[PDB]
Amino acid sequence: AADDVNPDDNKEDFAVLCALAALANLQTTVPSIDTSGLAAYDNLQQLNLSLSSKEWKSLFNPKQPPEGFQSDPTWRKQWPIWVTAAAALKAENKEAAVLARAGLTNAPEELRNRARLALIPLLAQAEQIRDRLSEIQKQNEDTTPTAIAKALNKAVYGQDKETGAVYNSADCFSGNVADSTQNSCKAGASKATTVAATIVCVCHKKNGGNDAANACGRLINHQSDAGANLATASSDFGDIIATCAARPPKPLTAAYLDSALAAVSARIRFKNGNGYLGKFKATGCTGAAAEGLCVEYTALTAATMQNFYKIPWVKEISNVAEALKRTEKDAAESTLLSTWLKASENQGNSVAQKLIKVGD
Numbered sequence: 352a353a354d355d356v357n358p359d360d361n362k363e364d365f366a367v368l369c370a371l372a373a374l375a376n377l378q379t380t381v382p383s384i385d386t387s388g389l390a391a392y393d394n395l396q397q398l399n400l401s402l403s404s405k406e407w408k409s410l411f412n413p414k415q416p417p418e419g420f421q422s423d424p425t426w427r428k429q430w431p432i433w434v435t436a437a438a439a440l441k442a443e444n445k446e447a448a449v450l451a452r453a454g455l456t457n458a459p460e461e462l463r464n465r466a467r468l469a470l471i472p473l474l475a476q477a478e479q480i481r482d483r484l485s486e487i488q489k490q491n492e493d494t495t496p497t498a499i500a501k502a503l504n505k506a507v508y509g510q511d512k513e514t515g516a517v518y519n520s521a522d523c524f525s526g527n528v529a530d531s532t533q534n535s536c537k538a539g540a541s542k543a544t545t546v547a548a549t550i551v552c553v554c555h556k557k558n559g560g561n562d563a564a565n566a567c568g569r570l571i572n573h574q575s576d577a578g579a580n581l582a583t584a585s586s587d588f589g590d591i592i593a594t595c596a597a598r599p600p601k602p603l604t605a606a607y608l609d610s611a612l613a614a615v616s617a618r619i620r621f622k623n624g625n626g627y628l629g630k631f632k633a634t635g636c637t638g639a640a641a642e643g644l645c646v647e648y649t650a651l652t653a654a655t656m657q658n659f660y661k662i663p664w665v666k667e668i669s670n671v672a673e674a675l676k677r678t679e680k681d682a683a684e685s686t687l688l689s690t691w692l693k694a695s696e697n698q699g700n701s702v703a704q705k706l707i708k709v710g711d
């Protein structure tokens with residue numbers, strides 16, 4: 352009976368599925384956009400406004416530009432930035448601190464003016480950098496530990512929640528289990544749409560004899576069974592998953608997720624017009640040792656493999672990986688954008704010293 356499903360015959364598939372199941376209820380840090388450069392730029396905007404004329408300061412003391420400028424594209428773009436700067440400068444002692452940092456406390460009017468003009472090219476250089484950093488911030492604002500946890504819990508357990516996801520056939524199988532195990536253990540009337548459903552299909556001990564208990568590992572203590580046609584799969588899944596200790600690397604990376612999906616894709620085997628994960632002998636993935644303990648990717652072929660990536664759990668993990676791929680790069684970019692903007696802030700605080708000494 353070497354060709355039947357025997358104990359340990361699905362053990363290597365199970366190791367990969369255990370790694371995927373450990374993405375449930377995940378608490379990971381995500382690469383963060385370093386937004387300290389936005390504050391550095393705001394400080395430059397505050398210095399610029401402090402040094403401005405009484406006529407200019409009067410425009411802010413709101414909501415949109417004054418008559419004559421409501422349609423000027425530069426005023427439309429800058430209005431919220433200027434308003435934020437004016438609001439910050441109303442705070443007790445804020446303007447005095449801004450001027451002190453710039454060496455402009457008690458500065459003569461001619462020095463204040465020359466200093467403001469000296470900031471023109473500096474602010475023009477910094478504007479481009481700050482706008483890119485703001486774009487990065489917005490483009491990655493949905494890449495958070497909470498959104499990732501929810502997406503991965505959808506992948507593993509079919510439950511759109513950040514924590515407390517647990518096995519429930521009503522969620523792990525799309526629409527709950529089917530009339531028969533063979534029909535439940537199909538994906539691509541798709542049913543086995545989560546990692547947990549995949550583990551049930553590849554590992555469960557059916558009731559009624561002729562089962563393939565311990566296919567996923569001899570150390571599983573199947574204390575019960577999955578019932579007939581997976582009717583009580585939850586009890587058996589608990590015993591199977593109790594053997595899984597996997598932990599993903601932290602912080603979670605796109606590369607790790609991509610490697611997990613690639614590994615699965617490299618294990619699916621095509622026979623007679625379908626794909627299979629888990630040992631398949633004959634008839635269907637019914638849970639009987641002489642038939643199969645498997646997911647049938649119905650109609651999946653090498654050439655239609657793109658459809659594997661549309662199965663819900665695969666799509667959810669792919670979406671997380673795509674988001675992390677972007678945020679990893681944008682986070683590394685943001686470190687430098689913010690360092691540059693802090694340097695521009697320091698530069699702006701130095702112009703007065705040059706101007707004083709040039710005048711003297």
Ligand SMILES: *[C@@H]1O[C@H](CO)[C@@H](O[C@@H]2O[C@H](CO)[C@@H](O[C@@H]3O[C@H](CO[C@H]4O[C@H](CO)[C@@H](O)[C@H](O)[C@@H]4O)[C@@H](O)[C@H](O[C@H]4O[C@H](CO)[C@@H](O)[C@H](O)[C@@H]4O[C@H]4O[C@H](CO)[C@@H](O)[C@H](O)[C@@H]4O)[C@@H]3O)[C@H](O)[C@H]2NC(C)=O)[C@H](O)[C@H]1NC(C)=O
Pocket residue numbers: 396399400402403404407420423424425426429467474475478
């Ligand atoms: C640091 O703080 C200073 C204030 O101390 C602030 O400066 C102000 O910046 C704005 C935005 O660049 C300047 O806006 C220009 O204003 C002129 C008219 O200026 C008069 O009126 C204003 C408001 O009462 C007075 O402050 C000023 O002294 C003058 O009395 C407009 O003509 C400008 O419009 C052209 O440029 C825009 C881009 O900046 C275009 O969007 C717009 O379409 C116009 O361009 C077109 O027309 C041009 C003329 O024909 C042509 O040459 C172009 O090719 C194009 O066809 C603009 O609205 C304002 O004057 C500045 N005020 C002072 C006192 O300097 C800085 O913005 C701030 N720095 C930062 C980084 O925030």
